Amino acid sequence: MESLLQHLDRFSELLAVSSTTYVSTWDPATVRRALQWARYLRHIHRRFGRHGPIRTALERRLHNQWRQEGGFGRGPVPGLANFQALGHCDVLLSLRLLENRALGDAARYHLVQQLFPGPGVRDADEETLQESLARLARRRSAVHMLRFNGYRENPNLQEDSLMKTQAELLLERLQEVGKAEAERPARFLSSLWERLPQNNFLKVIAVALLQPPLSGEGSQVLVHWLLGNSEVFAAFCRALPAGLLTLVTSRHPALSPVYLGLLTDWGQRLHYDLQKGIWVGTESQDVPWEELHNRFQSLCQAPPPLKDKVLTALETCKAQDGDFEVPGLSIWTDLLLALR
Template sequence: MESLLQHLERFSELLAVSRTTHVSTWDPATVRRALQWARYLRHVHSRFGRHVRIRTALERRLQKRGRQDGAPGSAPVPGLTNFQALGRCDRLLSLRLLENRALGDAAYHYLLQQLFPGPGVPDADEETLQGSLVRLARRGSAVHMLRFIGYGENSVLEDAVLKTQAELLLERLREVPKAEAEGPSRFLSTLWDRLPQNNFLKVIAVALLLPPSSPRPQGEELELGTPKTPGEGGQELIRWLLAKSDVMAAFCHNLPVGLLTSVAGRHPELSRAYLGLLTDWGRHLRYDLEKGTWVGAESQHVSWEELYGRFQSLCQAPPPLKDEVLTALESCKAQDGDFQVPGLSIWTDLLLALGSGS
């Protein structure tokens, strides 16, 4: 077991080196050995996929390495971060070497011979590296070509991209060691500081809308006995959002209204926080007698139109959410003095505008 772990350790180092200029010293024999190691590890992946003890030990070692390599704080080096990745480690190594211009001509020539032996080798064998590389490249082409379609008024591409990002985020969340109590939340905070925030918020929203236990869709990488914990990543996201009031405020402020309503409809904890924020925003509005409308006391306050738009969208949601929203509005209205005429309480006016005023 220890030798297997050492092997893994050495291969991770090799993988890190494969991106650097150090490969200029590699000769064909080095390339051959590197590919042999990779093949061995892929074999380990297919052999021990269902072997929980070995799998856990390997996974732990990979995660330890991942943290040493940088995370949290700096961007983790893409590489072997989980057991799944072992199944495609030979492809990963090959792609890095193919891209690395520092690799000498003789070594590169040898690499090509190994990767693309030509038509003599059985075509249908999906297991060959040649097959896997070509299939990946064809998939890349397909993405590239289908992208032509996505442009214009259509949001098909955007939807697909967000969904993919959400799946990746959930996958990473699953990998954060559970032993560390603050693990997931610290990980998310690091991302929040580092990534473009608006995109991150949208990805979080889409992740919260994915059906529970949506395994990462990768036809070829069979998830052998992956422990599935449905919605666990989603729970981590919610916990983090609720704990970070500034992020939660940005989440509710910046996302499209319809998207927020869908998220609120799925997650009662979030809908309560969202309603809390909305009532808070409502309290900042004052009635302008001259204009006959509700206006913000300060410019950063949410306008009447926006507030109304959000409530309207929530009231169009299916029953439990819709009722909850109306009840909340009614109770605010009662607290204000249960006025029936417009212009005195924003809640009365909102209920009237929504057509549910009593």
């Protein structure tokens, strides 16, 4: 059990420095050593990978590695990602060493010779490294061809594939941090928020809230993050489509009352001009009438437990701004009328 820690952590160091360009010292000995360690891990993954306390101990070492490094400072090194990455560590290693230009010429020949003998060991009982590498390029070229000859962005982001998958990478990556309990998902998602492109990110999160459960602690965590940090959630409602926020709401009622709160707060920074018969905002970024009609359009076009809520939240903000029953006074009269 402790025999594997000293093996795996020194292998982790070796793997981390692999893609770093100090490769001059390396020889066939280093390559042989790497690949036999990797075969051993691949056999570990096979033998006593499932239903072990060894299993959970290895993950603790892994996830503690990935939090002590951070994604912060010295380098944002990927590393081998998780429990499944033990099974194909070899190949990660293989791919990275080839990218590495500092690879001395003798090592590259012996390497490639060891990766792809030929069909001299065509009869191989274990799937050797050679066959996985073919399989890769294949799926890989495969994914090219679908993407550019029959892929389309579904409009219902929920029923897209990229988004739907990136979500699942996020859910798995928080399921691990939850078990670990070292840092709260909050800190992770704060750092994310700085680091990666926001429009992309949000859609992921949006769709993540919807994916039916895989072990919904995942979804339950994201709502606490969002309701906790107001500023991001303001951009969310602003960035997405309407049907997306509709389904967000009917699933998670914790989002109904603050979302409605944001519309209330946008409607009350408009003004009418008489000469063009239209509500418009003062400031350039102020969600237009067009957009605001639509989202309430949707929210109403929803199941019964939200329709009543929202419709009552209209009659209340109407009466607060005078119960006129004629247009050109109460934004909210306007809307309620515009829904027939």
